[PDB]
Design a protein around this ligand. Structure first.
Ligand SMILES: CC(=O)SCCNC(=O)CCNC(=O)[C@H](O)C(C)(C)COP(=O)(O)OP(=O)(O)OC[C@H]1O[C@@H](n2cnc3c(N)ncnc32)[C@H](O)[C@@H]1OP(=O)(O)O
Length: 230
């Protein structure tokens, strides 16, 4: 039988367990948790969807964030206090285009925001996992761009990172988001490098190759995971 495997060098086999999982006494007893992260342009949402198709319960942190500071949500009042009512649409919802203009590319302002929002999202993620476990789910994935920067590896058994070369990342960002190349590198500089992410990962994946190769990696990763679940 002839086949190909995917590797990262400076060897790490993509899909394999690279270092031991974390012990997590505080998580619900029936539940295994993956933290899924990657650099912008990594295509990690494609990977999250493939894990969803295999049966994982996905918690999308970006969405939880938007709900956290929806009117009625725990972060609404603090975010509006911290940034002012000029960030609000006419209907009183946060205008994320205006908020983004305040914080993107701006280290101090983004920190005012994430100091408020990240703890709120982490709490909402913990709540969602509890509900999922009550409804019989046994494997949860917290999909988060800034997982390691937020310290959220404390909430997961395994960190899974989706990586691609920085040149392809910048290309995907510039093209798909209509960013200037400087805005794209600004985005990338404002987060951990692929190598930093890899070093702190239990499993590494890549969307560098065509879609069928990504699927194969994810299936291989999923199968190995299943055999090491408690
Ligand atoms: C720990 C976590 O990962 S929590 C989930 C991420 N959320 C946060 O960090 C909270 C702060 N960010 C926000 O509130 C919003 O991103 C806003 C208001 C700044 C912008 O909102 P929107 O314009 O709707 O952008 P959206 O939320 O879709 O994010 C756009 C991109 O910026 C990224 N991004 C979001 N927050 C951050 C951050 N703190 N630092 C760097 N990049 C970020 C997103 O992951 C997304 O990347 P993608 O296009 O590769 O998926």
């Amino acid at each position: 039988a002839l086949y190909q495997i995917q590797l990262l060098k400076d060897q790490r086999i993509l899909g394999n367990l690279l270092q031991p999982p974390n012990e997590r006494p505080e998580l619900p007893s029936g539940l295994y948790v993956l933290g899924l992260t990657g650099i912008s342009g990594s295509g990690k949402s494609s990977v999250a969807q493939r894990l969803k198709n295999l049966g994982a319960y996905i918690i999308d942190s970006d969405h939880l964030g938007h709900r956290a500071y929806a009117p009625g949500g725990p972060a609404y009042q603090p975010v509006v206090e911290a940034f002012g009512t000029d960030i609000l649409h006419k209907d009183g919802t946060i205008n994320r285009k205006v908020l983004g203009s305040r914080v993107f590319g701006n280290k101090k302002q983004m920190k005012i925001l994430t100091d408020i929002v990240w703890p709120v999202i982490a709490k909402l993620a913990r709540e969602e996992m509890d509900v999922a476990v009550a409804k019989g789910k046994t494997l949860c994935v917290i999909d988060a761009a800034m997982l390691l920067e937020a310290g959220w590896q404390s909430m997961v058994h395994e960190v899974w990172t989706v990586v691609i070369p920085e040149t392809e990342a910048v290309r995907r960002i510039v093209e798909r988001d209509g960013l200037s190349e400087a805005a794209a590198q600004s985005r990338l500089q404002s987060q951990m490098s692929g190598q930093q992410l890899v070093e702190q990962s239990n499993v590494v994946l890549s969307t560098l190759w065509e879609s069928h190769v990504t699927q194969s990696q994810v299936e291989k990763a999923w199968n190995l995971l299943q055999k090491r679940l408690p």
